[PDB]
């Protein structure tokens, strides 16, 4: 806990505002107050007189819609000296330094004599306020010119917290009183005196706009405007009582910003409604109670950490919207009422103001989730979570923050369609003041109801909504708006539910003799799409059925139909970005492939079923030693193969799945390594013999394995199942593991590092391989989108020629990090969301100084305990002590299965490791500069190929895309199994052998999967090479060069590059075509 406290202090001091700028702004606004006193008074005026008064002036009154017309503006207007005061965070001295800048909230209380007791009706008070602001702006402008300060101030109107009913004047400074360096902007809030209007008449249930429906938003604006200093006084008391108030306030402010939470209005569509004020007020409420029994939840003696934790826990656990709400008294212990108002409510009985009116139900739910997630991070003891909680911005990219985003282009957008505008009507104008608020709810209710359980959270954002306008104009003018609507287009952002996102049928109310109300709304909502259907269990229910597709999720079809039916028939809903990602996944050549969803693993299961059939045959055969167990370890057994298994598609590199066959322990195993391996083959010979005789439908052949260095006697039995699947069997013996250790011990001290590498590859294939597939398969069921994203990630690597050096397991371990460690984000629920999160991680991963250690466990045992966590950290520090630059090892990936951390990430050349990070950084930078679209996604999956020294073009004699099981085809295995090689790509073996020969001079890369990344025919592949710095320049001639060189002087040689192409070409034979150097 001490580490957390010291980190908290370091954060506070880092963001602490410099006190010099406080004097500068205080030096100005103190003089500004004198100007406000200079402004003269004004007489009673009707709308006709004030309109003429302002007719020729540059200033324009910012009248709030509905603007006062001559008939209903019978009341008169007047101006008098206000009671100037300073409010907000600056008043409480709880502000922090913000590079984007902060704001100083100056309050001008309109004198009470300007108001009548019934001025809170029909915008009467708002229109009086508007002219009061306009008259001030007029006189403030001329006085500003008088004192020569106009040169460096810019004055414009703006809406308070994006509230259309509360325009305000914003003073900003451009490049003695010049406060540009301070990064502050003074806001002139024109509030009312306290208790001018009976607060009971302004309750949320009451109405104040005659047309009766309630007006919660309108009631809040007038009432909150009349209660500003009172809440300052309330927070002022709490600041004195508890010594840790300001420190907790900045922590919440920092926490809120990173999640993209602000105090602005949310009914418009932006995420917000909860800001520093609301967080501070809630904390103040909790310091005076908060429990159901009115007992204090927070104590004045709590520290900054404890005060923050309590507020986070209260939000996480207590529901304030549907079932329950909290009441407190500013001027009386706060009590949690179990009854709920169906909207966020933090009631203040003293002031009759609900502080959470600006928060929508949708935004509140996301708040509760974020609060809940951090509470889990805040209780975590094994891992430090300070940086995730406070020092990571998750609001930068919508796509990383939201699983799916749909942008809806509304019709006729210099005003919305008459039919669309007609839907607004007058009743909703009373309930929802602006059409933007009305449209936001309209999209929210239908989208929420339509998708139902398919989603967890929904956000409706009005893209391109402005909140500040010039003094010459009365309302904000949008280019598409024409002063009609303040937004470019609306974007629907969803957090999908992977378990039920791809359900084929949307269940509804059950059938009844008399059609229930729930049944009515379902049939009315869906119309022709609705149906009554019966299932195997015998239930009769109203349900509508959709069609799955491999290119888009079901949710894309639901939102399109629902929005068009209810919002407008001319709306255009589009999410092409998700479609591109889905298409980048290879399409298998199976029946109904296009109609299959990306979450369907039927192809993998079919391979498993064919394995289980072969599993029974092997066990029942009689051998000298009983079969202990047969463990499948192939990629397709953990749902990670890039292209799904396809029967008889034997050109695919991952066709032959590895299987570990282990016999019972015996003391007759040979004690010498080659004898042991030849003994293992003798068992595979017998399995093939009895398999060939008893089960002739199976075909089998033998192939050599050279993956383990210096163990050249490994022979694997390949079984070709009648179903069309291939399996590679290798025998594991208990004596084998100890024989390698013997070789290390008996090896000379100089050779020991080489032998331990041989052991490292053995354990990666035989011992560690079993554990990796077991955990990854079991976990993948809870993370539905893990299988598609890792496949697409392996597609991304291959296009950039990295899979040749990045082993399969290492890619999976990197690709699973966003799922097992989703903090500060959520678990991926989209193929687009998951892939980008992997790229985001690699971009910001400082593998030289930060290890990657994972808890391969299902969502909240096998969790890494503190002892195990520290031990793996110690392994990293010891390794980096000997390898500070990271030349030998770059990526440190560790977990329960691999505590060493070097098992799956050894042998990667440093050029490749930096390339992986370099590509990830450019991918993120490309996304920032240009938003996610069709063009950018194509740039992601196209390789540069220009950085490499020389580039080689190959073509296979025959296209392999069809034989790889990819739909843009063999239906049986060849009669002679030698014909299999005729339909294989050897370029993967080409680069591997050349790398060994030119390890000391060159680094060669190629595309492993030619069917997927080889054009339409899947026959084109490329070898790209790199010349190390040493041998690019000339070198003195010596025996130990180990490089192919040509003489220039008696003792100088240079890389005989022209010879090297011949050796590459001679190796390629017909396949090679062209060279670029």
């Amino acid at each position: 806990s001490n580490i957390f406290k010291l980190q908290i202090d370091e954060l506070l001091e880092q963001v602490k505002l410099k006190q010099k700028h406080v004097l500068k702004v205080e030096k100005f606004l103190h003089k500004l107050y004198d100007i406000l006193q200079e402004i003269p008074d004004w007489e009673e005026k009707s709308l006709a007189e004030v309109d003429s008064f302002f007719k020729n002036k540059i200033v324009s009154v910012p009248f709030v819609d509905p603007k006062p017309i001559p008939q209903n503006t019978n009341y008169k207007f007047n101006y008098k000296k206000p009671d100037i005061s300073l409010i907000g965070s600056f008043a409480l001295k709880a502000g922090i330094y913000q590079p984007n800048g902060s704001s100083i909230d100056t309050l001008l209380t309109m004198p009470k004599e300007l108001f009548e007791k019934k001025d809170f009706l029909n915008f009467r008070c708002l229109h009086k306020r508007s002219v009061y602001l306009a008259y001030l702006t007029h006189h403030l402008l001329i006085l500003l010119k008088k004192d020569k300060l106009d040169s460096f101030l810019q004055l414009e109107y703006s809406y308070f917290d994006n509230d259309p009913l509360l325009p305000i004047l914003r003073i900003s400074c451009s490049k003695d009183y010049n406060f540009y360096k301070t990064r502050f902007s003074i806001n002139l809030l024109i509030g009312f005196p306290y208790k001018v209007f009976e607060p009971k008449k302004l309750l949320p249930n009451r109405n104040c706009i005659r047309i009766l429906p309630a007006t919660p938003l309108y009631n809040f604006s007038v009432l909150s405007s009349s209660t500003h200093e009172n809440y300052l006084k309330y927070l002022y008391k709490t600041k004195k009582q508890t010594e840790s108030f300001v420190e907790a306030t900045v922590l919440g402010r920092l926490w809120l910003q990173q999640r993209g939470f602000s105090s602005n209005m949310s009914h418009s569509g932006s995420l917000g409604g909860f800001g520093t004020f609301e967080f501070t007020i809630l904390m103040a409420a909790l310091l005076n109670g908060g429990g159901i029994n009115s007992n204090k939840i927070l104590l004045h003696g709590f520290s900054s950490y404890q005060l923050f934790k309590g507020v986070i826990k209260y939000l996480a656990t207590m529901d304030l919207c549907h079932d329950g709400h909290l009441q407190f008294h500013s001027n009386p212990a706060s009590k949690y009422i179990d009854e709920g108002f169906q909207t966020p409510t933090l009631f203040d009985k003293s002031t009759k103001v609900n502080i959470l009116t600006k928060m929508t139900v949708s935004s509140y739910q996301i708040l509760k989730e974020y609060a809940g997630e951090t509470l889990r991070m805040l209780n975590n003891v094994v891992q430090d979570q300070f940086s995730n909680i406070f020092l990571t911005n998750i609001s930068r990219f919508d796509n990383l923050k939201y699983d799916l985003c749909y942008d809806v282009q509304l019709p006729l957008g210099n005003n919305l369609e008459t039919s669309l505008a007609a839907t607004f009507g007058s009743m909703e104008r009373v309930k929802f003041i602006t059409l933007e608020n009305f449209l936001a709810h309209k999209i929210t209710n239908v989208a929420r109801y339509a998708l139902g359980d398919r989603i967890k959270y929904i956000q409706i954002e009005m893209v391109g909504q402005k909140s500040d306008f010039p003094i010459t104009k009365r309302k904000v003018y949008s280019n598409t708006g024409g002063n009609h609507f303040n937004f470019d287009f609306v974007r629907v952002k969803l957090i999908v539910n992977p378990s039920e996102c791809d359900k084929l049928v949307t269940k509804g109310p059950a059938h009844s003799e008399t059609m229930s109300t729930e049944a009515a709304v379902f049939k009315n909502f869906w119309g022709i799409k609705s149906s009554l259907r019966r299932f195997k269990d015998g239930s009769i229910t109203h349900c509508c059925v959709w069609s799955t597709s491999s290119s888009e999720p079901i949710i894309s079809s639901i939102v399109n139909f629902a929005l068009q039916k209810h919002v407008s028939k001319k709306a255009q809903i589009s999410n092409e970005t998700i479609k591109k990602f889905h298409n980048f996944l290879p399409l298998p050549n199976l029946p109904s492939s296009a109609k299959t969803s990306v979450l369907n693993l039927s192809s993998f299961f079919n391979l498993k079923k064919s394995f289980d059939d072969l599993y029974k045959i092997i066990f029942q055969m009689k051998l000298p030693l009983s079969v202990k167990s047969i463990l499948p370890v192939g990629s397709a057994f953990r749902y990670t193969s890039l292209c799904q298994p396809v029967p008889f598609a034997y050109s695919d590199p991952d066709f032959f799945q590895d299987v570990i066959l282990e016999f019972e322990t015996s003391p007759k195993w040979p004690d010498e390594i080659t004898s042991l391996e030849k003994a293992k083959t003798a068992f595979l010979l017998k399995i093939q013999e009895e398999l060939s005789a008893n089960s002739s439908t199976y075909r089998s052949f033998f192939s050599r394995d050279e993956s383990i260095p210096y163990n050249l006697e490994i022979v694997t039995l390949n079984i070709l199942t009648p179903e069309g699947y291939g399996f590679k069997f290798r025998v594991l013996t208990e004596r084998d593991e100890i024989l390698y250790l013997r070789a290390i011990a008996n090896a000379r001290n100089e050779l020991k590092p080489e032998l331990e590498a041989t052991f490292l590859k053995f354990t990666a294939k035989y011992l560690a391989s079993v554990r990796h597939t077991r955990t990854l398969e079991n976990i993948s069921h809870s993370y539905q989108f893990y299988s598609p994203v890792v496949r697409l990630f392996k597609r991304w690597l291959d296009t950039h020629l990295l899979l040749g050096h990045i082993t399969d397991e290492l890619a999976e371990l990197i690709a699973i990090k966003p799922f097992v460690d989703p903090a500060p984000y959520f678990i991926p629920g989209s193929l687009e969301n998951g892939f980008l999160k992997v790229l985001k991680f690699i971009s910001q991963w400082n593998w030289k100084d930060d290890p990657l250690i994972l808890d391969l466990v299902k969502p909240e045992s096998e969790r890494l305990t503190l002892a195990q966590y520290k031990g793996i950290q110690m392994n990293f520090t010891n390794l980096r002590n000997s390898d500070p630059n990271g030349t030998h090892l770059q990526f440190f990936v560790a977990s329960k299965n691999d505590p060493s951390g070097i098992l799956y990430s050894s042998g990667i050349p440093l050029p490749i490791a930096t390339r992986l990070t370099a590509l990830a950084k450019v991918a993120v930078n490309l996304l920032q500069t240009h938003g996610l679209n069709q063009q950018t996604i194509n740039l992601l999956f196209t390789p540069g190929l220009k950085d490499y020294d020389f580039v080689v073009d190959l073509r296979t004699p025959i296209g392999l895309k069809s034989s790889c099981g990819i739909l843009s085809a063999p239906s049986n295995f060849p009669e002679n199994l030698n014909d299999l090689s005729e339909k294989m790509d050897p370029t993967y073996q080409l680069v591997k052998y050349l790398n060994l020969k030119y390890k000391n001079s060159l680094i060669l890369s190629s595309r492993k999967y030619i069917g997927v990344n080889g054009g339409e025919k899947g026959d084109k592949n490329v070898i790209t090479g790199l010349i190390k710095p040493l041998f690019k320049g000339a070198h003195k001639f010596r025996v130990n060069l180990d490089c192919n060189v040509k003489p220039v002087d008696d003792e100088n040689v240079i890389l005989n590059k022209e010879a090297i192409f011949h050796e590459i070409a001679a190796f390629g034979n017909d396949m090679v075509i062209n060279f670029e150097t």
């Binding site: 050029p911 930096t914 999956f941 390789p943 950085d947």
Partner: peptide, 13 residues
């Protein structure tokens, strides 16, 4: 195209 000059001193980190 997605191009990054190869870094052989690990300077990109």
């Amino acid at each position: 195209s997605l191009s990054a000059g190869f870094d052989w001193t690990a300077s990109i980190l």
